[PDB]
Scaffold this active site. Structure first.
Site, PDB file in Angstrom:
ATOM      1  N   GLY A  22      37.248  25.088  87.481  1.00 34.67           N
ATOM      2  CA  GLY A  22      36.901  23.687  87.493  1.00 34.67           C
ATOM      3  C   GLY A  22      37.988  22.843  88.107  1.00 34.67           C
ATOM      4  N   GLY A  24      39.959  18.960  87.682  1.00 29.99           N
ATOM      5  CA  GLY A  24      40.183  17.686  87.030  1.00 29.99           C
ATOM      6  C   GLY A  24      41.408  16.985  87.592  1.00 29.99           C
ATOM      7  N   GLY A  25      41.187  15.827  88.207  1.00 32.44           N
ATOM      8  CA  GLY A  25      42.283  15.057  88.755  1.00 32.44           C
ATOM      9  C   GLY A  25      42.676  15.638  90.091  1.00 32.44           C
ATOM     10  CB  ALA A  27      44.700  20.219  88.716  1.00 28.93           C
ATOM     11  CE  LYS A  28      39.929  22.304  95.175  1.00 29.58           C
ATOM     12  NZ  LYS A  28      39.915  22.900  96.547  1.00 29.58           N
ATOM     13  CB  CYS A  29      41.804  25.394  86.525  1.00 32.51           C
ATOM     14  SG  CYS A  29      42.688  23.890  85.992  1.00 32.51           S
ATOM     15  CD  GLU A  93      46.845  30.164  74.639  1.00 28.38           C
ATOM     16  OE1 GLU A  93      47.495  29.109  74.469  1.00 28.38           O
ATOM     17  OE2 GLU A  93      46.406  30.806  73.658  1.00 28.38           O
ATOM     18  CG  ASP A 138      42.043  11.915  78.117  1.00 30.43           C
ATOM     19  OD1 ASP A 138      41.120  11.266  77.547  1.00 30.43           O
ATOM     20  OD2 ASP A 138      41.901  12.501  79.212  1.00 30.43           O
ATOM     21  CG  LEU A 141      33.914  16.633  72.711  1.00 26.35           C
ATOM     22  CD1 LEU A 141      32.380  16.574  72.757  1.00 26.35           C
ATOM     23  CD2 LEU A 141      34.375  17.339  71.485  1.00 26.35           C
TER      24      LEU A 141
END
Ligand SMILES: CN1CCN(c2ccc(OC(F)(F)F)c(Nc3ncc4c(n3)-c3c(c(C(N)=O)nn3CCO)CC4)c2)CC1
Ligand SMILES: CN1CCN(c2ccc(OC(F)(F)F)c(Nc3ncc4c(n3)-c3c(c(C(N)=O)nn3CCO)CC4)c2)CC1
Ligand SMILES: [Zn+2]
Ligand SMILES: [Zn+2]
Lengths: 290, 290
Positions: A22, A24-25, A27-29, A93, A138, A141
């Site tokens: 995914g 977010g911001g 970043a890519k993970c 992790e 922040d 969920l």
């Protein structure tokens, strides 16, 4: 433009890049694995091309600085970082069961025992953070990750801040958190209490199946939070409803502190599973006796 | 995915798509020309794929509704709109000299006469809007377009709102304007005065060469606006400096009204060019006598 292998000069270690998780911001993970020990990790990869401004750099820097200093069962483990000339790489992790967001999308409202179970872990994670003078800021969920045992791991410290001295009130928050506390919107200074506020929203969302202050315009939602405009459904048990109310108060001085929480009647007088079965990702548990 | 020709069933008219001009929000803008009358236009093209939510649709809708109702020498002319199943198309007056933003990037601080000249037109445009009970709410340099004569045309009504009854105070503003007024940040309700505030910032920027409340964090800038933290350089003439101050006041009731402005000593006692030469895009004018 991301390399297929992630090499860290200084640690020696190499990482094969693997599946997307995914974005977010900045970043890519990705799943990555230590090409040697074959151990698997979550890799968060930020392009320096989105980090040209010093202000954006310092934020990236501050997130690593905070996250690096933390180790706890219910915080996403930090296992290192490095950079080449185009990317920052952060090795975290891996949480193989995604986050409470995907659970909530699939199950909407949870059973009380499930909510006790998850909230306990969220709270223990957060007690640890406050003990170390870190506000997350922040908690929501999709930041609450789940490992293969459905243990909670707080993640994403990109809006987190360090309380540098007693009584400090943070004047700004550069970001737009999801469950954002009233005193952040009214710029009156904020501290540890914004987290307890977010956990109040999480508790509401877990028990009710929707967030407390949802509307179609974000600016209306802010307005609602400002005026504390929300209602708890009549079927929510009164003990639970009580705890939601204690946490979702406009006055930060009025809310319980992260350490008060697990002593609340909500936890101490209700059944808290020792663990949940994976079935509960999709099927409500009945917690039958035999 | 945008068609090469833009056809409007109902008007008959067809438009050949031409050169890219830029992209703001959900829109991309292109030079287009009425394949028949060969007349040239600016075309603003929004993909319905970014308009799936009713709230985003209503905003797009509200912008057309406001913009369509306006005609004035210093407002960007509205010449129509239509949609196919994937796009909304809006046909606007083309401004061949871009905007005050590109001018300011090239010249930084303007001469007073240039600033009088542009501010006059900005103000006349805005007097028209207020006369029609429209607040623009995001007047800034890149919204102030210039035609081939260097006449100002106010554009982008995507944060504009309609004052529906006397004394109404708008409670929310869904968007993040550039020169944003203090009463918007402190959510106290806002009205026509936020525009006069923005023109105060524009006047400062035109005269000083930088915005009044710039910092590296947007949240610090908000804080500065909240506390009215800005300083006018000592070399700015006192009449000019006076007018900036009148407009940039925290108390909206205190600021001049759009109609008071052109009577200010700043205009009535200074030379206002009847027109500027194109040279002034790049070369400061000396306004010599012969
Ligand atoms: C909003 N949802 C999106 C999808 N999620 C999702 C989906 C798949 C995943 O892997 C596995 F398949 F093994 F379960 C995981 N697991 C997973 N594990 C560890 C991390 C992440 N995801 C992660 C982080 C961040 C961040 N910002 O710091 N974003 N993501 C995740 C990238 O968004 C921090 C480290 C999460 C959980 C959060
Ligand atoms: C910030 N800068 C970007 C580049 N600008 C720029 C550059 C080139 C241009 O055309 C010409 F070459 F003929 F001069 C023009 N001219 C031009 N003319 C008319 C319009 C626009 N641009 C336009 C609009 C919007 C909007 N949001 O509503 N954005 N853009 C413009 C798309 O951004 C409304 C209608 C402007 C002016 C504004
Ligand atoms: Zn909105
Ligand atoms: Zn910032």
């Amino acid at each position: 433009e991301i390399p297929e292998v992630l090499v860290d000069p200084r640690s020696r270690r190499r990482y094969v890049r693997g599946r997307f998780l995914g974005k977010g911001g900045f970043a890519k993970c990705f799943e990555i694995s230590d090409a040697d020990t074959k151990e698997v990790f979550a890799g968060k990869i930020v392009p320096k091309s989105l980090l040209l401004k010093p202000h954006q750099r310092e934020k990236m820097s501050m997130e690593i600085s905070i996250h690096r200093s933390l180790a706890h069962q219910h915080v996403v483990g930090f296992h290192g970082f490095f950079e080449d000339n185009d990317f920052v790489f952060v090795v975290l992790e891996l949480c193989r069961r995604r986050s409470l967001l995907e659970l909530h999308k699939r199950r909407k409202a949870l059973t009380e025992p499930e909510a006790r179970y998850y909230l306990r872990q969220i709270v223990l994670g957060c007690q640890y953070l406050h003990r170390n003078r870190v506000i997350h800021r922040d908690l929501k969920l999709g930041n609450l990750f789940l490992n293969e045992d459905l243990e909670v791991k707080i993640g994403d410290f990109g809006l987190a801040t360090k309380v540098e001295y007693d009584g400090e009130r943070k004047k700004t928050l550069c970001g737009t958190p999801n469950y954002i506390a009233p005193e952040v919107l009214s710029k009156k200074g904020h501290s540890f209490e914004v987290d307890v506020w977010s956990i109040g929203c999480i508790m509401y969302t877990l028990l009710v199946g929707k967030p407390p202050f949802e509307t179609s315009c974000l600016k209306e939602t802010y307005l609602r939070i400002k005026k504390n405009e929300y209602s708890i459904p009549k079927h929510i048990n009164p003990v639970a409803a009580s705890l939601i109310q204690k946490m979702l108060q406009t006055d930060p001085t009025a809310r319980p502190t992260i350490n008060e929480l697990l002593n609340d009647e909500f936890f101490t007088s209700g059944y808290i599973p020792a663990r949940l079965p994976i079935t509960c990702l999709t099927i409500p548990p009945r917690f039958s006796i035999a």
